[PDB]
Structure formats: structure tokens, C-alpha cells
């Protein structure tokens, strides 16, 4: 489903408010993109469905650090 | 048997392969029991007007005595050869051997 594998971001629900303040249900979807990440340690590419924020997290930390957290959570990659 | 006069002009970049073209066609006519009468090779001549944005086309003239089917397959070869520009086949009603 539309879940970021790194940050856990998933579709949240909110309202569309019009100028007349009419409320209709809507979903806020994460900015998800499949991306092949180069794992320097393992000499391979790992594809992850990540949000754009998830990509920024992977740049800030390491890819190995994020993979370790993914392995800890049981998230298979 | 019918007498034909074949003039075909060649791109002036394949002109060094013109002799390869010549003996291929003559073998076709002779192989089909024809006979070449003239085989003048005029070389690199100025065109009177640009053909396919060219000049210096390489003219080859040959008077042959072949049956119809050989001539059409020869014309077909000229048609599908992009090194040949503006072939021209004509009946001559007589074998022609005198120089041009």
C-alpha cells in the first residue's frame, strides 16, 4: 500500500474546505517514489518505495543506517 | 533479341566502385546469353543541373543485346541501387559499336 518504507508515512485523511467552508473528505497522500538506492557496503542496489522526505532522511543518515532500522522493524526490502 | 542502350549515372562518391558495378551487369547480360557491344565509361562529368543536390555524376554507357527479362531485372537493379541516379534504357533497333 501507499506507505513509505523509511518513515512510515501513509495516506492520512482530512477535509477539502471550500470558500463556503463546505467540508468533504479527502486523503493526503505521501509523495512516494520507488527508488533504487546504492548500498555501498553490499555492492548492490536496493529498491525502496520511499517518500521524498524518506529520501532526505536517507541522505542525512546512511542508507545502511536506514536499512538497519528497516531490518529491525521487520520491514522487508 | 533486342538491342538496348543503357546509360546510368553514378553518385560521384561510389565512382571507384563503378567498375565493380560494370562487370556485375555485363556478367548478368552475358550470363543470360547476351552480348555487350559498347562499354564506354565517360567518367566524372559536370551535370547541366543539380540532381539530388549533386554534380560530377559518373556516366556509364553500354549497348547490349539481351532478352527482355534481363533488361527489366537490370532496370530493377538500377531502381533499388541508391548509388545509381537516373538510369536510362532505350531500344536501338541495331547493334551499336562505334564510339560516341
Amino acid at each position: 500500500s501507499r506507505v513509505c518504507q523509511v518513515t512510515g508515512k501513509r495516506p492520512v485523511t482530512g477535509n477539502n474546505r471550500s470558500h463556503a467552508l463546505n467540508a468533504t473528505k479527502r486523503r493526503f497522500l505521501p509523495n512516494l517514489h520507488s527508488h533504487r538506492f546504492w548500498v555501498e557496503s553490499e555492492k548492490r542496489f536496493v529498491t525502496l518505495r520511499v517518500s521524498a522526505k524518506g529520501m532526505r532522511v536517507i541522505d542525512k543518515k546512511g542508507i545502511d543506517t536506514v536499512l538497519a532500522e528497516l531490518r529491525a522493524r521487520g520491514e522487508k526490502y | 533479341m533486342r538491342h538496348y542502350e543503357i546509360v546510368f549515372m553514378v553518385h560521384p562518391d561510389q565512382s571507384e566502385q563503378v567498375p565493380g558495378m560494370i562487370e556485375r551487369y555485363t556478367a548478368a547480360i552475358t550470363g543470360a546469353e547476351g552480348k555487350i557491344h559498347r562499354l564506354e565509361d565517360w567518367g566524372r562529368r559536370q551535370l547541366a543541373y543539380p540532381i539530388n543536390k549533386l554534380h560530377k555524376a559518373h556516366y556509364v554507357l553500354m549497348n547490349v543485346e539481351a532478352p527482355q527479362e534481363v533488361i527489366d531485372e537490370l532496370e530493377t537493379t538500377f531502381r533499388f541501387n541508391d548509388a545509381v541516379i537516373r538510369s536510362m534504357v532505350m531500344r536501338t533497333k541495331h547493334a551499336v559499336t562505334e564510339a560516341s
Binding site: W38, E40, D59 | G20, N81
Partner: protein, 149 residues
């Protein structure tokens, strides 16, 4: 994105700079290839303090034996087989694949992706001035001839 380089980069590299590249440039090209690593303080000392010379020597002793082409002309102007008809007109074209294997001993010596074809794949009988990029600044200029056998 701040990144510390590991080799010579054409327009921003001096093998040790901390240039600010776009994230896509580092993430998709610079890092997956052996060219740069992220400029975390962990790496900066772990780059500068101990390898500021050994990867310099490794790159220099690797640029050597790469700048040593020894294949500027392998044997002669190499002649390659192909199937074609009359009037030149290569039926089966010659590409980076065929050039590499034929120029070497069945392709073992040299890889396939370092062959540069300014005229694209070869489509006519004749000799052509193909390049060969063995290393980031290496231009081998073998003349390859193709014959219709």
C-alpha cells in the same frame, strides 16, 4: 548537498574538495560510482586524516596503466568481418559490441562500454576513426576497417 570527492570530477572535482552539489547529482551519479562520498564529519576526518594521500597514490597509479593505453593501435588498422552486399551497404552493422571483442583477444582484455563511436554504429564498408575511453582522460584512436565477408 555537501560531498567529499574521491577522484577528479570534470567541472567541480580536485580530489578532495567539499563542493556543494545537487542531491540528485550525488545520490544518483557521484556516490554509486567511485567518485565521491557524503561530507559528514565522520567521513571528513575519515577522508582527510588517513587517505588524503593513499587514494591519491591509488588514483595516480591507476591513471597509470590506464593512461598507458598500449592499444592506440592494437596490431594494425584492425579489419573486422561483416556481412554486406554490393555498393558497400553494411547489412549487419558493427557496434560497440563487435568492436570490443574483435579488437581484443575475444573481448577478454578490454570491456565493452569504453568504446566511443563519433559516427555511431558502422553502416558501410570502410575504415572509421573510432575512439576509446579507457579512463576519464584517455582517448585511444584505433582505426577499424570493416570488410564484407
Amino acid at each position: 548537498m555537501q560531498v567529499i570527492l574521491l577522484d577528479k570530477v570534470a567541472n567541480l572535482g580536485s580530489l578532495g574538495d567539499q563542493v556543494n552539489v545537487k542531491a540528485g547529482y550525488a545520490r544518483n551519479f557521484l556516490v554509486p560510482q567511485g567518485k565521491a562520498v557524503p561530507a559528514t564529519k565522520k567521513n571528513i576526518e575519515f577522508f582527510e586524516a588517513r587517505r588524503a594521500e593513499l587514494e591519491a597514490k591509488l588514483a595516480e597509479v591507476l591513471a597509470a596503466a590506464n593512461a598507458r593505453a598500449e592499444k592506440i593501435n592494437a596490431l594494425e588498422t584492425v579489419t573486422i568481418a561483416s556481412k554486406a552486399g554490393d555498393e558497400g551497404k553494411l547489412f549487419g552493422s558493427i557496434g560497440t559490441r563487435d568492436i570490443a571483442d574483435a579488437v581484443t583477444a575475444a573481448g577478454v582484455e578490454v570491456a565493452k562500454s569504453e568504446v566511443r563511436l563519433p559516427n555511431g554504429v558502422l553502416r558501410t564498408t570502410g575504415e572509421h576513426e573510432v575512439s576509446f575511453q579507457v579512463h576519464s582522460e584517455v582517448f585511444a584512436k584505433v582505426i577499424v576497417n570493416v570488410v564484407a565477408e
